[PDB]
Amino acid sequence: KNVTHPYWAPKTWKLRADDITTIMGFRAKLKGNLNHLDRPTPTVVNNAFIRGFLTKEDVMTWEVEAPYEAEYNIALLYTGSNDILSESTFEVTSGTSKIIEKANVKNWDTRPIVQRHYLKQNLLLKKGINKISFRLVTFGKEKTANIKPNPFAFWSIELVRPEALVAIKERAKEIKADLQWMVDGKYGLFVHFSSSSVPFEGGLKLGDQYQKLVKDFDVDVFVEKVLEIGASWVTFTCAHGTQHWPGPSKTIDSIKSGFTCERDLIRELIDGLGKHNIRLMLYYNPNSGMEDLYGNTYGNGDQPDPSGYFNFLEAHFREVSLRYGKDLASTAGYIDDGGWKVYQLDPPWEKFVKAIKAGNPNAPVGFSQNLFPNLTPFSDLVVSDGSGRVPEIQPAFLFEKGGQLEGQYPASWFYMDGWSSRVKNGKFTQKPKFSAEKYIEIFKKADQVNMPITINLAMTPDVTKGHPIFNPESIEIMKKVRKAVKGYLE
Ligand SMILES: C[C@@H]1O[C@H](O)[C@@H](O)[C@H](O)[C@@H]1O
Ligand SMILES: C[C@@H]1O[C@H](O)[C@@H](O)[C@H](O)[C@@H]1O
Ligand SMILES: C[C@@H]1O[C@H](O)[C@@H](O)[C@H](O)[C@@H]1O
Ligand SMILES: C[C@@H]1O[C@H](O)[C@@H](O)[C@H](O)[C@@H]1O
Ligand SMILES: C[C@@H]1O[C@H](O)[C@@H](O)[C@H](O)[C@@H]1O
Ligand SMILES: [Mg+2]
DSSP states (O other): OOOOOTTTSSEEEOOOOTTOEEGGGSEEEEOTTTTTOOOOOSOOSSSBBOOOOOOTTTEEEEEESSSSSSEEEEEEEOOOOOHTTTTOEEEEEEEEEEEEEEEOOOOOSSOOSEEEEEEESEEESSSEEEEEEEEEEEEOOOOOOOOOOOOOEEEEEEEEOHHHHHHHHHHHHHOOOHHHHHHHHOOOEEOOOOOOOTTTSSSSGGSSSSHHHHHOOOHHHHHHHHHHHOOEEEEESSSSSSSOSSSSSHHHHHHOOOSOOOHHHHHHHHHHHHHTTTTEEEEEEETTTTHHHHHHHOOSSSOOOOHHHHHHHHHHHHHHHHHGGGGGEEEEEEEETTTTTGGGGGGOOOHHHHHSSOOOOTOOOOBBBSSSSOOOTOOOOOOOTTTTTTTOOOOGGGGGGOOTTTTTTOOEEEEEESSSOOOOOSOOOOOOSSOOOHHHHHHHHHHTOOOOOEEEEOBOOSSOSSSSSHHHHHHHHHHHHHHHHOOOOO
């Protein structure tokens, strides 16, 4: 009863013998109870999990193509009730090769919710077409809003020759970013220049008058507020809701006109913030409005092909990174939905990372991993949407060898009042979530454990002298935060 548009349907997967190959569960043939949410169009569907592993007949089968006979290390990504996991046994088969292994219980209280399980024994694969099957052979049950169930939910399988993994990890280690400047700066400002946002003075949402509002953006007004709250960096939102880009881009323009600006606002933000040694990183969203820029990520025509889209992302990262060089701290401080959306295309993470660092070899890579474990060994920062909640403190063993987050460094991304400003009738509708004293404790804790915080204060897309661009109550709180954390202490 499961539905997949041809671009999402099961197909034979080419193994990349020198790389980590990832294959979503819905690329397997499913039998028995196994099911997933419908995927009826070329557009990615976040909720990709396979559910219904209830009996020994509930089995999924991929078809993969190896270039030569070799042993492959298998990782599984899954989630579910610890009650269910504590009694689930996995079985991975191909040819005569068979792996049997108990599931791992999630013994941390934080994200990641999905865990990556490296199976101890390797799977031998013959040259050419191999069928690989996954099923459970022992089963648990949930025990005592406790309404929604938490079944075993399979996300993906990952295949990598053990020798390729050592070499991959070696290279990741050699280009790992040095984040001391973020720890020393303690916190920065997330600013959403959001295409859905309506200006303080009313009128068209930023998305429908993007170039005009970029041309009228008052950098000096913006920098003085950033400076006043003591931010050490700014993460600035490119392509939030549409693919509009606040500066020149040969890469974007060669796909489709109308998204770029004559004014190089990124450069002016660099220079304006640079006068006070405040650094700039870029948020970028590779999916929102992408159907109006590139089109379907898997292209047109009868069979899915992501190389055009991959080449766009790589050429875009590369052009931005080289355009600004070391003046731009990162063209990829926050790449939205790396977990929910980007991961589902089995993308070439390393090529993206090399593009990101081409102009700035220490540029931190921050793919948003959502509730998922580390997306690629070439990550630098833990990144996900903290909403307006108190920042979680992930326990240290997550970062040790074998850990879910190994190679990453802890970091928090959350908002004081909201993400996108919702100003209506000259009044901010989004108030700070907590008292000033609670934010002070939050930043003091982040500082004591050397975890950078990037806090969003909803900003009016029309940045001018005529009106507060941030909520004055929010500014007042951050001024008290600055005093308690960055001010003269005694
Ligand atoms: C054979 C596989 O086909 C898919 O469409 C791609 O997304 C994979 O990266 C690989 O090329
Ligand atoms: C730009 C925004 O990014 C988020 O990740 C999405 O979930 C929103 O709906 C919107 O697309
Ligand atoms: C067969 C598929 O149908 C869809 O409607 C199209 O958007 C795809 O690109 C492809 O042509
Ligand atoms: C702007 C540059 O960003 C890089 O990521 C940093 O490592 C450098 O110290 C410099 O500040
Ligand atoms: C940083 C946040 O990322 C999330 O994925 C989005 O849904 C929010 O709008 C915001 O942009
Ligand atoms: Mg510190």
